[PDB]
Design a protein around this ligand. Structure first.
Ligand SMILES: Nc1ncnc2c1ncn2[C@@H]1O[C@H](COP(=O)(O)OP(=O)(O)O)[C@@H](O)[C@H]1O
Lengths: 242, 244, 51, 195, 252, 195, 61
């Protein structure tokens, strides 16, 4: 009723995540990362030493359950296993501790870009950080978009029912040329997007949105105006004449 | 370009309005419209931008992470109480103990409208204080779900002022297409049923606003999608039981 | 006769204390609703009588 | 200085017209006033083409459309009667609820009990007729919409904290044997006509 | 078996009502049971054993006889060794709880008898039978309709209108208008200062107007097409006046 | 064997109750019958604490709340009639419409017919106090929506092909028109303060 | 299914079950009629069909 159930529960969770990523790949396979490349995901497993120490302890517990000593060897083997649990619990943020007791830490993550027709991997980022600030922002913004699309889509449907997603300073490390591609990917997933942008990037979004809410503070009273880009420019012209 | 623009709003519900009343720094009643082909919230830094997102994230999540944009990685600074009270912690210069904009009895309402091929679904929330107390348990809540276009946040506030909470219950009884939930747990379950998405979908949506603090694919995946579900607390219970 | 509300609360508390267990299928999303639903299953099952 | 109906009577009639029905379990006082003077109330409502339908057994007074001889039927066309005629899907639910209210009434005590049914109870009954939409969320939403339409007719209450609804006594006078027989005859003609 | 006795009366109430509902000459088997003042719920199986148990329990002397002997027995030193606190306490107050439980059952039987007696009045058994029969007919007949067609599902039915409510008469004098006050002043301020960008910070505007490279690209492409000659950077600036200086050049 | 009220009178009273007013230009038949038997209609409405307000000059009948003594009960309540307080924008738009209606009445004599107005004429008036929403498109949208709300209250009609809306005669009777004047004075005074 | 919800002491439920079992016995007695086989044989409730396609062109040929 414990330990084994806790260990089984964690292993079950990892299985769910592997299934979720597997069923998230099919959603991304419908959208082209590059003009004709599209993107895929690989999970892999963590090889942290703490996990290997756990597997040895579990093997000892299983072997101990068959000894006829009035639950003496079974108790000892369980004692070692629980000690491992507390050790990780005390240091609740060490990489070894997290991998032991966190479902999303027992397996790695890696993105792979392929060819639409040629199935061979063309560029596999098997973790392999090795990327500029913009490149990582490109991968992350795309991966989140695919994750958001899948989450909001009702089971068995490829069109989300809750079509609004909100991004707050989404793009800051990517050039205006690569930022437009993300907006292209976001729309093609079927997600209506409401962007919160800093003073910068205002023309970055001007090519991918038709209206804007202007938030200006007037002391201790914030105000908002929903004005189309065309009506916003007219306000600027009055400013230029004011 | 434009041809794809018409897909949104056909097979899905797209936000098309936001109304606030004494929320954060948005004193009084404000209304913001959203375009079906995308929309941008722009303005000088620290005016109202992150407050607007938080008002929407409150309507959606059970325990929204307020200000995940800048405070991502550590605990958020603001909370529901501050937004209702309209504290101005950051903004100072003569700060008289945080500039509680509304210290006395107050009522704050936030309503979001979503549309799809003429069908309107308006979420809402009424949060009010009856006194000067600022403890969490002294805030009275009334989550509202509505499909009738005539049920606007202005109407709800008008009802509250006229006859308080008693009139609100009476209004729901005779109102068509209105549902009011005094406890947010029931209201969230209604959202899941309507949009046919689990709690994870909306919790991820809230985490999408804190995407700024991102790193290698590992940290994006282990901190952004596929919510915690860790077993660090069950381990303590198992360890304590083993001690016996 | 125990008032229905008190039983719903008492049953709900017990459900939460074993949310970890897989066999019970206890859902942390809203235990109080799960507590109430469980009683009704045993009221129409004729284990208990509601009056 | 002029003929004024008793203040108790005016208040009772207005409450009757405002809510449509008066129940002893909720407003016993005004209930007795109307009961004590049925002739006076009937005279007041005659100009409006509305008549009071009394049920002393259940302690329930309700207002109904009064047709003199043959006002072209279409009682729903009365200017003061809001709402729209019940449709087939709502009628199917009304029978489902009424079949629940009859069962509760058979096992009825001597005081107020306010027949209640869990919302989850109606789902299997409805799914037989409306089919499986694909998911529980879809069917739960479908049921909530139907109950919401009925609540406008006064037949139920919005689901409470336990997801339980209350079937109001007015159902016993809507789907009563007289009206049920008329509906059954109409439905039979519909079945024959389609074939 | 105190609980078992209550179940029997519940069932007896169940069976008795069914006979009243399910019998076609209600007038007969109603008066024969209403004018009478007997039990009307005489479940002679467990339920008359309870009646006998009540008679023995109500006898005085003996019941107080046990209670004294019990406490004498619970007082024995070996009794604590035999039983425990819970069992000892339960055994000590045993006679008290038996009377309370006996009282509990007796009120329940009296209640159920009164309830069933109330049901027999109001003569609604006939209506329940007719209504129960009609619903089973309507529900079984409704299986022949097509419920997947909105035309069928939205069909009007001849059910009457019961519970007509006259509410919300216009009564033009009913309308009241906003009165000057602090909120009225606040509302005026919000309406005026909304879409009032004059006080907006200057920098916001400058960041608003920046080089839109999409337009610059096509203009350049057209310019190269017209000249159709190798053009250096200096010439391009002369021909095309950059409004942002190095920003345009980086594009080129 | 009964004393059923005249069918036409019953039709008018139900018509009056549903819409709250009767106009000679619209329902000449119903309006005339009420005039012929004013005593009967007032008798019919007496038990409901209601009354009919006769206005022959403008050819308009409206129902007024005929309450009891109600000593200085400015917060009077009527179960059938629900009190509503308009918004500041709706209040101002009503106030602007009210004053213009009276001006038309003076300029053409009392009892005028079809006191119209143009949409383009109202926009400058609204822009003065409410301020600039941000563009001509927004100014029209705000004005049109406000007109929509007022039409729901029965004070104005939808706009015709010429972008003109007719003020309904009901505006003459508005319970407490003084506060309408006071708001406009407070509004004008505020703008004078700004300038 | 509809009769299972009636409150009549298992009378409508019994009648509907009787109809169903009568159908079952009718099928059993004529244990080789196409109708009976479809009713009571798993591999007779569904048809069977073959389709030759193109290795690269997925359309049925
Ligand atoms: N609940 C609150 N707690 C603290 N400050 C608040 C709160 N609501 C509003 N404010 C103040 O209003 C302004 C909100 O700035 P905001 O636009 O929302 O952040 P951001 O720069 O990310 O866009 C800040 O000056 C802040 O101090």
């Amino acid at each position: 009723d414990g330990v084994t159930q806790l260990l089984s529960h964690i292993e079950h969770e990892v299985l769910v995540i592997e299934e979720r990523l597997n069923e998230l790949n099919e959603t991304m396979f419908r959208v082209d990362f590059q003009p004709d490349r599209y993107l895929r995901l690989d999970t892999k497993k963590v090889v942290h030493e703490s996990l290997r120490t756990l597997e040895k302890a579990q093997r000892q517990l299983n072997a101990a359950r068959f000894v006829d000593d009035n639950g003496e060897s079974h108790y000892k083997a369980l004692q070692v296993l629980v000690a491992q649990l507390r050790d990780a619990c005390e240091r609740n943020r060490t990489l070894g501790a997290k991998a032991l007791l966190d479902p999303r830490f027992r397996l790695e993550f890696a993105v792979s870009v392929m060819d639409r027709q040629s199935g061979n991997v063309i560029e596999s980022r098997t973790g392999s950080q090795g990327g500029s600030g913009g490149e990582k922002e490109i991968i992350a913004s795309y991966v989140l978009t695919a994750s958001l699309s899948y989450a909001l889509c009702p089971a068995g449907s490829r069109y989300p029912l809750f079509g609004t997603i909100i991004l707050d300073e989404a793009f800051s490390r990517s050039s205006h040329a690569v930022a437009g591609r993300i907006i292209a990917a976001l729309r093609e997933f079927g997600l209506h997007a409401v962007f919160i942008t800093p003073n910068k990037e205002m023309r970055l979004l001007r090519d991918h949105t038709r209206s804007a809410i202007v938030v200006h503070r007037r002391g201790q009273n914030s105000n908002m105006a929903s004005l189309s880009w065309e009506e916003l420019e007219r306000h600027y012209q009055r400013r230029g004449n004011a | 370009m434009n041809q794809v623009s018409g897909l949104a709003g056909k097979e899905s519900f797209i936000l098309t309005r936001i109304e606030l009343f004494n929320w954060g720094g948005f004193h009084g009643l404000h209304q913001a419209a959203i375009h079906q082909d995308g929309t941008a919230v722009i303005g000088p830094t620290g005016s109202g931008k992150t407050t607007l997102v938080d008002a929407l994230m409150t309507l959606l999540c059970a325990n929204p992470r307020y200000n995940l944009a800048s405070t991502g990685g550590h605990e958020s600074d603001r909370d529901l109480i501050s937004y209702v009270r309209g504290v101005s912690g950051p903004g100072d210069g003569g700060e008289g103990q945080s500039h509680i904009a509304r210290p006395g009895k107050t009522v704050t309402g936030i309503a979001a409208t979503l549309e799809r091929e003429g069908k309107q679904v308006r979420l809402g929330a009424l949060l009010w204080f009856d006194s000067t107390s600022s403890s969490v348990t002294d805030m009275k809540r009334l989550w509202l779900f509505s499909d009738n276009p005539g049920q606007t946040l202005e109407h709800w506030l008008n009802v509250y002022h006229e006859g308080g909470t008693r009139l609100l219950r009476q209004m729901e009884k005779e109102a068509i297409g209105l549902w009011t939930y005094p406890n947010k747990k029931q209201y969230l379950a209604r959202l899941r049923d309507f949009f046919e998405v689990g709690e994870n979908a909306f919790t991820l949506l809230n985490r999408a606003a804190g995407l700024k603090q991102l790193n290698s694919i590992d940290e994006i995946f282990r901190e952004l999608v596929l919510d915690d579900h860790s077993a660090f607390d069950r381990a303590a219970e198992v360890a304590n039981s083993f001690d016996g | 006769g125990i008032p229905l509300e008190e039983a719903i609360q008492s049953l709900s508390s017990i459900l939460i204390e074993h949310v970890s267990q897989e066999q019970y299928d206890i859902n942390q999303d809203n235990p109080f609703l799960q507590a109430s639903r469980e009683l009704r299953e045993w009221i129409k099952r004729r284990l208990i009588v509601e009056r | 200085s002029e003929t004024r109906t008793l203040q108790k009577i005016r208040e009772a009639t207005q409450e009757l017209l405002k809510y449509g029905l008066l129940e002893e379990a909720s407003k016993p006082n005004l209930y007795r006033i109307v009961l004590s003077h049925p002739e006076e109330v009937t005279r007041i409502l005659e100009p409006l083409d509305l008549d009071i339908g009394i049920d002393e057994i259940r302690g329930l007074l309700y207002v109904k459309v009064r047709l003199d001889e043959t006002p072209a039927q279409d009682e729903w066309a009365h200017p003061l009667v809001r709402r729209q005629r019940l449709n087939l899907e709502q009628s199917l639910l009304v029978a489902i609820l009424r079949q629940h209210f009859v069962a509760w009434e058979q096992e009825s005590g001597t005081g107020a009990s306010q027949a209640q049914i869990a919302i989850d109870d109606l789902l299997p009954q409805l799914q037989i007729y409306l089919g499986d939409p694909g998911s529980e969320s879809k069917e739960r939403t479908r049921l909530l919409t139907l109950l919401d339409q009925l609540k406008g007719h006064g037949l139920v209450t919005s689901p409470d904290a336990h997801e339980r609804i209350v079937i109001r006594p007015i159902i016993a006078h809507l789907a009563d044997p007289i009206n049920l027989q008329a509906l059954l005859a109409w439905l039979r003609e519909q079945i024959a006509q389609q074939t | 078996d105190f609980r078992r006795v209550e179940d029997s009366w519940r069932e007896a109430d169940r069976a008795l009502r069914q006979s009243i509902i399910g019998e076609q000459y209600h007038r007969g088997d109603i008066v024969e049971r209403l004018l009478n003042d007997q039990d009307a719920l005489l479940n002679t199986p467990e339920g008359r054993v309870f009646d006998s148990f009540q008679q023995q329990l109500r006898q005085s002397s003996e019941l107080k006889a046990m209670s004294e002997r019990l406490r004498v027995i619970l007082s024995h030193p070996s009794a604590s060794d035999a039983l425990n606190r819970l069992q000892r306490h339960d055994l000590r107050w045993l006679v008290k709880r038996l009377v309370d439980e006996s009282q509990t059952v007796l009120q329940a039987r009296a209640r159920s008898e009164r309830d069933v007696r109330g049901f027999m009045k109001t003569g609604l058994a006939a209506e329940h039978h007719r209504v129960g029969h009609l619903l089973n007919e309507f529900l079984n007949l409704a299986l022949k309709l097509d419920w997947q067609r909105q035309m069928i599902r939205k069909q009007e039915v001849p059910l009457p209108a019961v519970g007509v409510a006259v509410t919300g008469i216009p009564a033009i004098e009913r309308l009241r208008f906003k009165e000057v006050d602090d909120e009225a002043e606040q509302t005026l301020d919000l309406s005026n200062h909304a879409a009032d960008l004059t006080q907006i910070g200057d920098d916001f505007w400058d960041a608003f107007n920046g080089l839109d490279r999409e337009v610059l690209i096509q203009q350049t492409l057209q310019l190269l097409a017209k000249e159709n000659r190798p053009v250096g950077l200096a010439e391009l600036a002369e021909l095309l006046p950059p409004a942002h200086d190095l920003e345009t050049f980086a594009v080129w």
